[PDB]
């Protein structure tokens, strides 16, 4: 019997034993299933990969390799659905994306 982790059985990068322990000891329900920590691991994979992919594009746009919280700010509030999810949270050291009202600037 050689121990094989079940982050590898489902083929994920996020841990499944950690999210299972944390979901148990955070007294959500009285019993947990077997498929629930695998399912949560998968959706956290998808969300992290999606927001980080948009931040990577926005970092490469300003000719920078290493990413900044400003780039996370632009990738969050420059999309639409991911803006709708995180619409109420602020972000540290993020700033505001540029817009000026239309009838304010001269013509």
């Amino acid at each position: 019997a050689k121990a094989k982790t079940r982050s590898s059985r489902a083929g994920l990068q996020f841990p499944v034993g950690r999210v299972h322990r944390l979901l148990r000891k955070g007294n959500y329900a009285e019993r947990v299933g077997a498929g629930a920590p695998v399912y949560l691991a998968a959706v956290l994979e998808y969300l992290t990969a999606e927001i980080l992919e948009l931040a990577g594009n926005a970092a490469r746009d300003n000719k920078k390799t290493r990413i900044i919280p400003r780039h996370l700010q632009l990738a969050v509030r420059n999309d639409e659905e991911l803006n709708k999810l995180l619409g109420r949270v602020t972000i540290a050291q993020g700033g505001v994306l540029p817009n000026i009202q239309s009838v304010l600037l001269p013509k």
Binding site: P69, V89, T90, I100
Partner: protein, 86 residues
């Protein structure tokens, strides 16, 4: 553990600071009565979030308002802040 009781307390939030803070918002032509009003509404906000943060501090029987107490005060206040643990 000393006290250098210095006057002119709240309006150390100066008007060039508040005017920069409005230029980031996208405004163009600020009146002269914005200033005392904005100091008032900032004090209202800061009152509420510090009241809740010091309640969370006092509950765990400590003397230091930590960062996590302020994150929790903002969390239940309505507006979450990422960046400072938790």
């Amino acid at each position: 553990r000393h006290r250098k009781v210095l006057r002119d307390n709240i309006q150390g939030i100066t008007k060039p600071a508040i005017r920069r803070l409005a230029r980031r918002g996208g405004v163009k032509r600020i009146s002269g009565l914005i200033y005392e009003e904005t100091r008032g509404v900032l004090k209202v906000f800061l009152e509420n979030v510090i009241r809740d943060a010091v309640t969370y501090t006092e509950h765990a029987k400590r003397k230091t308002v930590t960062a996590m107490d302020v994150v929790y005060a903002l969390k239940r206040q309505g507006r979450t802040l990422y960046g400072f643990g938790g």
